[PDB]
Amino acid sequence: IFEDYLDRYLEIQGWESDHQAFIQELENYVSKIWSLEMLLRQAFWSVPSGKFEDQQPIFIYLYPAYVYAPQVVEAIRELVYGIASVNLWDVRKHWVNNKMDLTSLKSLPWLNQLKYTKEDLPFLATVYTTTREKTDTDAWVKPAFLALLLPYLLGVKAIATRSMVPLYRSDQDFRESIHLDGVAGFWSLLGIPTDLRVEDITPALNKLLAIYTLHLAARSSPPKARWQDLPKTVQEVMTDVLNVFALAEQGLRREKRDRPYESEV
Amino acid sequence: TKIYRCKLTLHDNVFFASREMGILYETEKYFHNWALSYAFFKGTIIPHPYGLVGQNAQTPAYLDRDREQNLLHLNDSGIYVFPAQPIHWSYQINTFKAAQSAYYGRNYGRAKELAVGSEFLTYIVSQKELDLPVWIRLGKWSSKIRVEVEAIAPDQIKTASGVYVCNHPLNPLDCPANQQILLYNRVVMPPSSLFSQSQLQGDYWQIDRNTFLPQGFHYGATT
Amino acid sequence: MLDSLKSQFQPSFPRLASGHYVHFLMLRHSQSFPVFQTDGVLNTTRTQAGLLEKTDQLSRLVMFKRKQTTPERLAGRELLRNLGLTSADKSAKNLCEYNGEGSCKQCPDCILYGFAIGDSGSERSKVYSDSAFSLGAYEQSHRSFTFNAPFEGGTMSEAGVMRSAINELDHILPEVTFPTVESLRDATYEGFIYVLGNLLRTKRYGAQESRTGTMKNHLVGIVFADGEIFSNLHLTQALYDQMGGELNKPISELCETAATVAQDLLNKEPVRKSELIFGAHLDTLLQEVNDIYQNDAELTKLLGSLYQQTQDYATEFGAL
Amino acid sequence: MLDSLKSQFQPSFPRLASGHYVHFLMLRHSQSFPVFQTDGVLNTTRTQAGLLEKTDQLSRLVMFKRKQTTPERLAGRELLRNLGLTSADKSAKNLCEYNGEGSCKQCPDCILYGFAIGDSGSERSKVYSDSAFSLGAYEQSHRSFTFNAPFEGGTMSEAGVMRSAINELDHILPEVTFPTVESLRDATYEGFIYVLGNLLRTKRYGAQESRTGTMKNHLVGIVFADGEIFSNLHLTQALYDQMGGELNKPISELCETAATVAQDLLNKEPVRKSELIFGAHLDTLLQEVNDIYQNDAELTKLLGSLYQQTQDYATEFGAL
């Protein structure tokens, strides 16, 4: 099946062909490949056999914008093998500090003089999350953040999906920067689009961090973020904007504090 | 002699199972010529049998002169649609399933459809004036297309011969003698792959200063 | 009224298609909270707001062809089993099951809405139809409702630990209108009464039909033609423009406007139109067809005749 | 009365639907401050006030999608446990856990109201229900009350530290009415007596059942039909129009008006109507059903029979 798969989909410039081949392609008209590709993911990404939906696997696929130069595909190699498992607790801290400018997010330690030179060059650069509480909103909070973030840092195009098969990108499939296949309902509740053009990505990062940094103030505990409650924090903020202060006040009561600090005001 | 520029705008999402990959089935970004020819001319020229039975229910009849649904009828009427170039497109991936009609239940798939926000461009060529329909249906879901169509007048066509790059799609099965393909780029598709771009040697029509249409193409001319 | 229309229909189902379309123009009104979903969200698409060359885009709800055609289809099969023209029992000679190899090849459903078994036979759907669109924007036209499911003991906890049942769902609001054209090709008079039956007799759509999704199908005109007329999208874009987006108007004013936009559109497209049933000719067609569907004897005669026409088609031209 | 109605029903549950709807037309009167909420506010929606005449928009309370079927369902399950036909102790052969695996898949709740959790498939509810609307506007039909929770020493401070326990909640007023049709498909005669039993024997609905939300269900008609009659919104808008909104009428005058608007609407529906139990025939039938539900021998016999029918259905067509 594989030898026919290259003869169907690979071309090197100047290989001989006749149009007496397309006669056979019609005559044949009158897969095990994706199982082999999944077997490579089990082998080289170290994802589970036979039990995998219960690890809540979300894949972000980083397509190029149009063309990469030889140095930038090598730079994306250093990304996909070296990316940090993101923690939203310090991403909030470095954004509430720095007075809400999302350009601050550029400066955080996102990685873990090339070190990955034996690894394959990433033509389809995929990055993937794992979480250890078992719910969906908890599964989606880090992928949704990463899928907005990486296009803002690197100019790449993201699809975030549970799907092992991607949408393959091409010259006007590229007409959006991000797609998010089937996010938890906190996303639809915020009314942020599931597909974003490149101008919208900083509005999206602002709304997403503003609701994360507001959920983590009240309806959270310092070692346990309780993202299971994020849909209620979104629904009250969207209903009427003064609920931002209702959430502030919930924070104060948890914290056993009767009054805000001058900064929090 | 006559040439018609047809712009196709999608009025509901269009699905064709062009390639299939696990649970997801997807629609190629070019409408194949033979699909458009039956969408324009089935019932008006090619016969449209409601039922099929036996091998004729599973075997195509594109270029079989014994079977009724043949595109060769169009060769005779002297018409040829080319395949369709995508001008603006978007995709929706939407799931579909089989229904639980019974009170008790114990399959399903994802369609990558071309969406309502989309427009495609094709060209028809004829020996005679043609009453082309302002609505057609395509694909797995018999999905509506608005066709807005203009005849290219003789004040804007010219005829010539030499080497030219066809920026339009083209079907290699319909390629005659007195045209030869020097270089090509292809889009892989049932029932046959198309060229998305090609360099040809032969006769052509400069229908505007930035597109070239191969002259003398007709259904199955290589075959 | 209907006695004059008996002139338009074919006398028996033909082998090859003809170009005799009877088009049903409808406004589908939500009455309680339908759920037109795939993939866990309400279906939408971006569209131009109305036909006059707008800069203005609008995300409107889409009810896919599947989501409306199957509730009409299954409500026809139930009626045929009530009449005893088909049966659910496997040992009976008139069994039909909805899709599989055991799907019939002769009953009215199989011939009007189609089947594909494989080498053992296939048949094209004679009812052509389109995906329907919300007249207004999505943001004006939906709401999300929480839902929980406790222990019967009144309580989210059992053995002192919480039950994981709380989630949002997105629901359409109880007056949002979906302009639709349903179109039937090469039909007999009795086939037209069966299909028009489904359009008026079925009332629940989308997910969760057991608890939600009631709709009122207001039929607004019938148009006989030499080919297919406009799309659902084109009717919705015309109707939005005839109102200028001032959508908060009563249902009967919206039905009375839908008749006038339909006639304005039909004049512009080049297909020849044999008949145009609108206004007081439609309201008499609807009452005299309701009187068939309320009478045991005439409906058992009329749908029985559909059966014969369709069994005759099956042995003469179909899959035998 | 019931001795004639026995003919209308089917002898056992079928695997596919066969028409055979029974429609329970109700007015639900509030008696004591119901709370019908999702998302922390009373569910409310903008609708046209009435069908033909009073065609202005109006916001009405919504007794949302589940709030008028879980009370019924759980009160019937309690009866199945009182009669000993089902049990709630683990390590019993007749267990039925609500909203889990270990739901019985054989009892009348599992068959009439459905199941979907775990292995061994899912079952569609044969009871069809809808969201109901207040006949009056939200502004005439609710009030906000404040709730405190002082410390047991009788004051809202416990060490001079205040107690943060004062909020307010909105409650629907007494004597406000919610028109409804709940519908039963393919029941046996005992299955009809069970479902009708739930409608007459239930008394509490909203949030905070433990303190609030008593209601008085007046069954105003029972209609036997091949398929679904008018929407819940449509009965409400018809009833509002029949009064012109002069809604401050005693509950008997309101129930007698609802019986007459319901009969007017039924004559405009494309449905064969086999039997229409209203007025003196209904207040005889309700009395004959009260005579079942007050007698242990009749009731144990009748619901034991249903148990067998539903268990038979389970092993022949359902999960066994």
CSV table of C-alpha atoms in Angstrom, one decimal, chain A residues 7-9 19 21-27 29, chain B residues 18-19 28 30-34 62 80 83 169-175 184-197 217 222:
chain,number,residue,atom,x,y,z
A,7,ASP,CA,3.5,7.0,-6.7
A,8,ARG,CA,0.0,8.6,-6.0
A,9,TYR,CA,1.2,11.7,-3.9
A,19,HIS,CA,-1.3,10.8,-19.8
A,21,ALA,CA,-1.5,6.8,-16.8
A,22,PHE,CA,-4.7,8.8,-16.0
A,23,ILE,CA,-6.6,6.2,-18.2
A,24,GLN,CA,-5.6,3.6,-15.6
A,25,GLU,CA,-6.6,5.9,-12.7
A,26,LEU,CA,-10.2,6.1,-14.3
A,27,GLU,CA,-10.2,2.4,-15.0
A,29,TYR,CA,-12.2,4.0,-10.2
B,18,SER,CA,-13.1,13.2,-2.7
B,19,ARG,CA,-10.6,11.6,-0.3
B,28,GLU,CA,-11.4,18.9,-2.9
B,30,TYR,CA,-11.9,22.2,-7.4
B,31,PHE,CA,-15.2,21.1,-8.9
B,32,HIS,CA,-14.5,18.3,-11.3
B,33,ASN,CA,-15.6,18.7,-14.9
B,34,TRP,CA,-17.6,15.6,-15.2
B,62,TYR,CA,-19.1,8.3,-18.0
B,80,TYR,CA,-17.8,21.3,-23.0
B,83,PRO,CA,-13.4,22.1,-14.3
B,169,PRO,CA,-7.9,23.8,-14.3
B,170,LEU,CA,-8.1,21.2,-17.0
B,171,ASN,CA,-8.9,17.5,-17.2
B,172,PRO,CA,-6.2,15.4,-18.9
B,173,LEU,CA,-8.6,12.7,-20.2
B,174,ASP,CA,-10.3,15.4,-22.4
B,175,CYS,CA,-7.0,16.4,-24.1
B,184,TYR,CA,1.7,20.2,-15.4
B,185,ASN,CA,0.7,20.4,-11.8
B,186,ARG,CA,-2.1,18.0,-10.7
B,187,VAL,CA,-4.8,17.8,-8.1
B,188,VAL,CA,-5.5,14.1,-7.3
B,189,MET,CA,-9.2,13.2,-7.4
B,190,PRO,CA,-11.8,10.5,-8.3
B,191,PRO,CA,-12.8,9.8,-11.0
B,192,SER,CA,-9.6,11.2,-12.5
B,193,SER,CA,-7.0,13.7,-11.4
B,194,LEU,CA,-7.1,17.2,-13.0
B,195,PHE,CA,-4.3,19.6,-13.8
B,196,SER,CA,-4.5,22.8,-11.6
B,197,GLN,CA,-2.0,24.5,-13.9
B,217,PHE,CA,-11.2,19.8,-25.7
B,222,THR,CA,-7.8,10.8,-25.0
